Symmetry: D2
Subunit: 140 residues, 4 copies
């Protein structure tokens, strides 16, 4: 459903049932250095005051940054998982879409780093979220 | 509902339709200095690898921190919204619950700061999330 | 001096006595959207392991970001001060120089945000540092 | 001079010559779970506006958190180095001292995490700085 990178033959939880499937995250482009995704704003994305939830921008950043790393390292026997996230909220989003662009800024052996920009339909930069992703040898 | 602070006669989005109500966040205690909330793990809270989504710890921290601020400042004519968030992920959660405790560490005239601990059912510290909350005069 | 923006007739501390002058920070370019600064590595910039001190990347980012804000807002009756900083360390620097480039990404009425890149003499990205800058009316 | 943990027979740079020796950082208590340090404010610690430099609070946090980790892991064949820092500035310090308390919150196999509180002489919490420290096998 969401176009997450297909790196495994099966997954513990299907897209539609995940947080990401529930709120409607969809990945558009995906390369080792850059990934983009979007989501249509609906109440399920908002908090009680009618604005997109701060948690939604973080979740979209965490998924996109982590999965962009997974797309490269999994076939090398590595697992990749977000280790830290820092989000700044510059302006709220009331409706329309949120579009995320993840740009790889450092790729170390144990940690990758991505800057994610989150824009509204007018192209205004509404939030930024940077992700540090830990890369470790798969256990299983 | 989620027991969010009842400060206004009408809210733009009903609890059950918000992201918060969708994933099942509920506030337990709330005072000016400290607040606690919890959620049952379901697939809606998970990513496709079967663990609680990074976004979920951040979303919980953000609502809890911001709303504990609203609880104080709203009746004073002020609006409060998360301005930034920094989250670090120490151990995953596969199932059970996530419990948040938010401790106010600074209450400035324009900015309030909260540290939020996220623990599993064994009590282990799985993530921490710092929230900075902007406090501004309410627009009419 | 360090070529900091000349916005006032008197400053409480002379360049050469500040932390900035002590370690040798110097601003090269400064515009409303972008500013650059550099420092020669000396032992004064190092920790006891012989590498550039973590604090030094943060100090450089903080002065550069805040002062690029002062450069705009001071003549408008506003004071600007760093409010938060997030720094990630990708590679150490043993010797040579550290070059900073600060790019303004949001300019709000109360908060400005800058991303600062810190590079070695080979051009490699050694650290990044995000600064949030508070902008408030100047106290008389 | 600064009471840094004595874990090696020699060091690349002597205390007095380091950033830390220059500005005057001194460690008081040091255990695996908690460390404290202070520094006397003098112009060398301040920026041109007469307030303690934002970089000074970060440097004191980075040193104290990293060195508290070094104190445990070095004798186990590990190196420890700060990997990220996030600092919030709640109130400025004009003079007197800055006192730092570092509290260990997580100790993983590859990353430790410390929260550092930075107080003035009245005991007010002026800044907080959290440090993530990478722990890796020594190379040499
Ligand atoms: C944070 C801040 C208020 C700081 O203001 P600033 O940096 O000085 O920016 P500025 O004041 O230039 O205004 C930018 C925009 O912010 C909004 N804004 C600014 N000030 C105000 C205000 N006093 N009242 C209402 N909106 C404001 C407004 O949209 C403004 O655009 P415009 O109408 O002025 O063109 C502004 O950047 C902002 O509103 N950012 C977005 C906040 C946000 O989206 N937060 C997400 C976390 S919210 C917490 C959360 O997740 C949550 C979840 C559940 C729950 O129940 C409660 C909270
Ligand atoms: C990041 C890191 C691996 C660093 O490991 P560490 O500091 O070395 O901790 P240590 O290695 O001491 O092990 C502690 C626990 O981490 C886990 N862990 C560590 N290494 C591994 C590994 N190679 N494989 C699996 N689990 C591991 C494991 O649970 C371990 O406990 P135990 O099984 O050993 O008792 C660890 O702290 C951790 O796993 N943190 C949790 C990461 C997390 O929960 N991320 C949340 C954002 S995740 C990304 C995200 O949101 C997302 C959403 C959608 C999507 O499609 C993809 C991702
Ligand atoms: C944190 C980390 C080790 C993570 O490693 P990574 O993401 O796996 O990067 P990778 O492992 O891909 O290696 C990249 C570079 O890191 C360095 N590095 C990585 N592993 C090691 C290691 N085991 N031993 C020494 N250097 C290493 C090395 O320079 C390497 O390049 P190369 O020599 O391999 O060409 C690496 O990104 C790094 O070294 N970052 C710089 C850390 C830094 O500069 N810290 C600044 C705050 S440091 C703490 C501080 O301020 C302080 C002040 C006073 C005091 O008394 C003590 C500390
Ligand atoms: C950031 C902010 C202004 C936000 O205000 P707030 O969160 O609403 O807190 P609140 O307004 O309740 O006031 C707390 C204290 O802040 C100070 N403050 C607050 N507003 C103002 C103002 N408009 N004018 C002057 N001082 C103020 C004042 O000390 C106040 O105490 P009191 O006199 O009100 O008792 C306040 O928390 C603050 O001043 N924090 C400290 C800022 C700081 O120390 N920054 C360090 C980085 S500064 C950037 C830097 O490193 C640098 C280095 C070199 C260089 O050349 C330039 C910069």
């Amino acid at each position: 459903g969401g176009n997450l990178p297909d790196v495994a033959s099966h997954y513990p939880v299907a897209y539609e049932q995940t947080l990401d499937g529930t709120v409607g995250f969809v990945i558009d482009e995906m390369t080792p250095e850059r990934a983009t995704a979007s989501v249509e704003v609906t109440d399920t994305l908002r908090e009680r005051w009618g604005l997109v939830h701060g948690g939604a921008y973080c979740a979209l950043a965490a998924m996109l940054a982590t999965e962009a790393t997974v797309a490269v390292v999994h076939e090398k026997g590595m697992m990749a998982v977000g280790q830290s996230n820092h989000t700044s909220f510059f302006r709220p989003v009331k409706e329309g879409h949120v579009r995320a662009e993840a740009v790889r800024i450092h790729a170390g052996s144990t940690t990758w780093f991505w800057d994610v920009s989150l824009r509204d339909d007018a192209g205004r930069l509404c939030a930024v979220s940077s992700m540090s992703i830990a890369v470790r040898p798969r256990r299983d």
